[PDB]
Design a protein around this ligand. Structure first.
Ligand SMILES: OC[C@H]1O[C@@H](O[C@@H]2[C@@H](CO)O[C@](O)(CO)[C@H]2O)[C@H](O)[C@@H](O)[C@H]1O
Ligand SMILES: OC[C@H]1O[C@@H](O[C@@H]2[C@@H](CO)O[C@](O)(CO)[C@H]2O)[C@H](O)[C@@H](O)[C@H]1O
Ligand SMILES: OC[C@H]1O[C@@H](O[C@@H]2[C@@H](CO)O[C@](O)(CO)[C@H]2O)[C@H](O)[C@@H](O)[C@H]1O
Ligand SMILES: OC[C@H]1O[C@@H](O[C@@H]2[C@@H](CO)O[C@](O)(CO)[C@H]2O)[C@H](O)[C@@H](O)[C@H]1O
Ligand SMILES: OC[C@H]1O[C@@H](O[C@@H]2[C@@H](CO)O[C@](O)(CO)[C@H]2O)[C@H](O)[C@@H](O)[C@H]1O
Ligand SMILES: [Ca+2]
Ligand SMILES: [Ca+2]
Ligand SMILES: [Ca+2]
Ligand SMILES: [Ca+2]
Ligand SMILES: [Ca+2]
Ligand SMILES: [Mg+2]
Ligand SMILES: [Mg+2]
Lengths: 144, 144
């Protein structure tokens, strides 16, 4: 079978409500750790979000993934192996305007930045309804 | 809308007995809930939310019973998805109504949990510290 993901819901960068930093991958390969960093106009910070729940990095073509299988731990880019821990929903309940939380299908835990200030490393954590867990899809070419 | 976008009332939540502020330890707006001097910090600005949760201006956190029986009340993450549970919802009970030295009419009421059906309470009939839930027994310290 040719694997379908459904449509194409979004294509952009993810700017953090708390810090205005961009959801970023280390280096510019599009592979490895995911962390918060300055918005840079590189393809490694652009993601495609599909109906099936996958967030696919535009540079590397691979999935926003959580360590192991539980849906709890560090987040990085990893092969898309059709698992539920690589699938995310965007519940309207945890939005504030255009800034929204990403809820992991395997653990009902939120895409999260360590601490309260939305500046550190990116993993999953309990949905706490705090600005540092909320991201806006952005379509500009802005840099810092 | 992860925030309380429809507040019924915002201000200092005082005890009818002691005239003291219901307070969260520290100034972050997370932690244990107990009475304390009114220090004018935003964590003491309590939000009586239209959805029935109780929150504060310092942090998007809910007045939460720390158990299922007669438990302590902490300020912790709001469970907002799939929907706010009954354990984190509250309602007005009976209401004493009075006029303070400011010449302003205030309305003190019981604050009843919707899961346990119990009352927001301070230890004894005037401690004057640690807050939790208890049985509703019409003492002027279970009125806020
Ligand atoms: O926030 C971490 C940053 O990491 C850099 O990653 C690469 C490392 C490893 O080789 O060293 C560079 O050569 C430095 O430019 C990078 O290729 C990224 O440049 C930053 O964008 C950022 O991801
Ligand atoms: O490192 C990210 C990847 O983690 C894998 O899980 C690892 C398993 C063994 O494969 O054991 C750990 O070392 C600790 O639990 C994990 O690093 C996942 O299978 C991959 O999907 C990926 O998430
Ligand atoms: O798993 C990350 C979690 O980090 C918490 O913040 C921690 C505090 C207390 O240890 O200090 C740090 O070391 C700063 O990075 C963190 O480990 C956050 O409050 C949680 O929301 C969560 O992200
Ligand atoms: O009894 C709790 C009180 O806590 C005060 O905050 C204290 C600050 C003082 O800088 O530092 C701590 O020790 C913790 O870091 C707190 O205990 C608040 O100012 C009071 O409002 C009150 O909540
Ligand atoms: O959890 C407190 C509850 O129990 C009673 O208050 C206790 C009495 C014990 O006789 O004295 C204290 O030690 C206060 O100094 C309390 O632990 C009350 O009858 C209940 O209303 C309730 O507050
Ligand atoms: Ca990068
Ligand atoms: Ca995984
Ligand atoms: Ca965090
Ligand atoms: Ca305080
Ligand atoms: Ca009492
Ligand atoms: Mg990471
Ligand atoms: Mg308490």
């Amino acid at each position: 079978y040719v694997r379908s993901r459904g449509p194409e819901l979004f294509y952009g960068r993810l700017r953090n409500e708390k810090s205005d930093l961009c959801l970023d991958v280390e280096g510019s390969d599009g592979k490895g750790n995911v962390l918060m960093y300055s918005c840079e106009d590189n393809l490694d910070q652009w993601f495609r979000y599909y109906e099936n729940g996958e967030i696919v990095n535009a540079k590397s073509g691979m999935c926003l993934d959580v360590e192991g299988s539980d849906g709890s731990g560090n987040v990085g880019i990893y092969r898309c192996d059709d698992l539920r821990d690589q699938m995310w929903s965007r519940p309207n309940a945890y939005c504030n305007g255009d800034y929204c939380s990403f809820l992991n299908k395997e653990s009902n835990k939120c895409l999260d930045v360590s601490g309260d200030q939305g500046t550190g490393d990116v993993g999953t954590w309990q949905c706490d309804g705090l600005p540092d867990q909320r991201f806006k899809w952005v379509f500009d070419d802005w840099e810092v | 809308q992860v925030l309380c976008t429809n507040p019924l009332d915002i201000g200092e939540l005082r005890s009818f007995k002691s005239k003291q502020c219901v307070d969260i330890v520290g100034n972050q707006g997370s932690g244990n809930i107990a009475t304390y001097d009114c220090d004018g910090l935003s964590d003491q600005q309590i939000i009586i939310c239209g959805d029935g949760t109780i929150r504060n201006e310092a942090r998007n956190y809910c007045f939460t019973p720390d158990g299922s029986g007669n438990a302590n009340v902490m300020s912790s993450p709001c469970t907002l998805y799939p929907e706010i549970p009954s354990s984190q919802r509250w309602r007005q009970g009976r209401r004493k109504t009075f006029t303070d030295n400011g010449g302003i009419e205030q309305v003190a009421t019981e604050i009843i949990n919707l899961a346990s059906g119990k009352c927001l309470d301070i230890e004894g009939s005037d401690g004057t510290g640690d807050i939790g839930v208890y049985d509703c027994q019409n003492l002027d310290d279970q009125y806020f």
